[PDB]
Amino acid sequence: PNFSGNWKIIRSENFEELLKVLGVNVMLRKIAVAAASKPAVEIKQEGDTFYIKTSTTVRTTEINFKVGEEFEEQTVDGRPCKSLVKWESENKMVCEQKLLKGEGPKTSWTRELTNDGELILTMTADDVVCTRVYVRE
Numbered sequence: 001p002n003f004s005g006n007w008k009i010i011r012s013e014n015f016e017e018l019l020k021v022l023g024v025n026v027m028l029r030k031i032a033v034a035a036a037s038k039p040a041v042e043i044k045q046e047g048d049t050f051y052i053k054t055s056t057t058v059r060t061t062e063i064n065f066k067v068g069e070e071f072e073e074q075t076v077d078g079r080p081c082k083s084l085v086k087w088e089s090e091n092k093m094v095c096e097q098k099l100l101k102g103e104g105p106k107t108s109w110t111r112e113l114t115n116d117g118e119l120i121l122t123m124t125a126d127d128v129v130c131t132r133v134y135v136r137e
């Protein structure tokens with residue numbers, strides 16, 4: 001049950017559709033979609049403590065959190081939110097997000113370590129689901 005490692009993406013689907021439901025104009029979606037197809041992901045895990053750095057040419061995010069403890073991060077479209085991660089199963093964590101200001105689509109994410117050694121990340125916005133699959137570099 002160790003997510004630690006440097007991960008590279010091998011499959012991504014419905015990412016643009018995700019941004020579309022968030023109301024991002026076409027020009028910006030193009031820039032985001034292009035850069036998001038080549039992320040560099042670093043994860044450091046110790047017990048329930050996580051450090052996840054996701055880097056792209058146009059944006060880098062770093063989150064630090066303890067499963068079960070509320071923290072603050074940003075939605076995919078850059079809006080400040082309060083998040084809470086819980087273990088849904090032994091190798092699957094689910095995160096429920098809550099906007100700090102205003103309204104918007106219900107968003108969340110999940111990260112799961114599969115039995116073949118891969119990592120599946122799913123990001124949701126209302127009914128749209130983006131699936132991203134990684135493998136260690």
Ligand SMILES: CC(/C=C/C=C(\C)c1ccc2c(c1)C(C)(C)CCC2(C)C)=C\C(=O)O
Nearest residue numbers: 024028031032035036039056058059077078
């Ligand atoms: C890599 C990844 C996600 C990458 C997302 C990127 C780059 C992204 C997302 C949204 C945006 C931008 C970039 C830029 C900066 C163009 C500004 C416009 C908005 C609409 C605010 C997820 C993962 O795989 O964990």
